[PDB]
Amino acid sequence: MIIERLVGNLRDLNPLDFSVDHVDLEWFETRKKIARFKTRQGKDIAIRLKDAPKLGLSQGDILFKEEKEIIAVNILDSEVIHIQAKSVAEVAKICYEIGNRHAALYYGESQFEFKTPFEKPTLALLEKLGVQNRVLSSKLDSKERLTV
Amino acid sequence: IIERLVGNLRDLNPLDFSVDHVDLEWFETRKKIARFKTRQGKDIAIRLKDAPKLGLSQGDILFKEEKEIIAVNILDSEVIHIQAKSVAEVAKICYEIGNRHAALYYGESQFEFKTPFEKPTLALLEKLGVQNRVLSSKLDSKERLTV
Instruction: Rounding to the nearest 10 degrees, give the CA dihedral for residues B98, B103, B109, B110.
Output: 20
Residue ending a domain, among A59, A75, A91, is A75
Cβ of A98 and B97 within 8 Å? no
Q: What are phi and psi of B28, to 5 degrees?
A: -100, 5
CATH number for the domain that contains residue A127: 3.30.70.790
Tell me: do A70 and A13 sit in the same domain.
yes
Are residues B50 and B99 both part of a single domain? no
Both A7 and A18 in one domain: the answer is yes
Distance from CA of A140 to the nearest CA of B (A): 17
Inform me whether the C-beta atom of residue A46 falls under 8 Å from chain B C-beta atoms: no
Q: Do B145 and A96 touch (CB under 8 A)?
A: yes
CB A122 within 8 A of CB A98: yes
CA closest to A148 among chain B residues: B96
Mutate to test the interface with A, among B82, B89, B92, B94 (most CBs of A within 10 A): B94
Q: What angle do CA A139, A132, B143 make, to 5 degrees?
A: 115
Structure determination method: X-ray
CATH number at residue A46: 2.60.260.20
CA-to-CA distance for B125 and A17, rounded, in angstroms? 46
- Cβ atoms of A15 and A70 within 8 Å: the answer is no
**B52: distance to nearest CA of chain A, Å?**
17
Which of A90, A100, A114, A147 to probe the B interface (max B CBs under 10 A)?
A100
Indicate the number of domains in chain A: 2
Closest residue on chain A to B124 (Cα): A148
Round to whole Å and give the CA distance between B121 and A105.
Answer: 20
Q: Tell me: do A70 and A88 sit in the same domain.
A: no
In contact, B112 and B82? CB cutoff 8 Å: yes
Resolution value (Å, 1 decimal): 2.9
Instruction: Say yes or no: B146 contacts chain A, CB-CB below 8 A.
Output: yes
CB contact under 8 A, B95 and A88: no
Partners of residue B112 on adjacent β-strands: B83
Residue of B nearest to A146 (CA): B92
Omega before residue B13 within 30° of 0, cis: yes
Structural domain boundaries enclosing A125: 76-148
B107 and B122 in a common domain: yes
Work out the minimum CA distance from B106 to partner chain A, whole angstroms: 8
Count of C-beta atoms within a 10 Å radius of residue B103: 18
Give the N- to C-terminal CA distance of chain A in Å, as an integer. 33
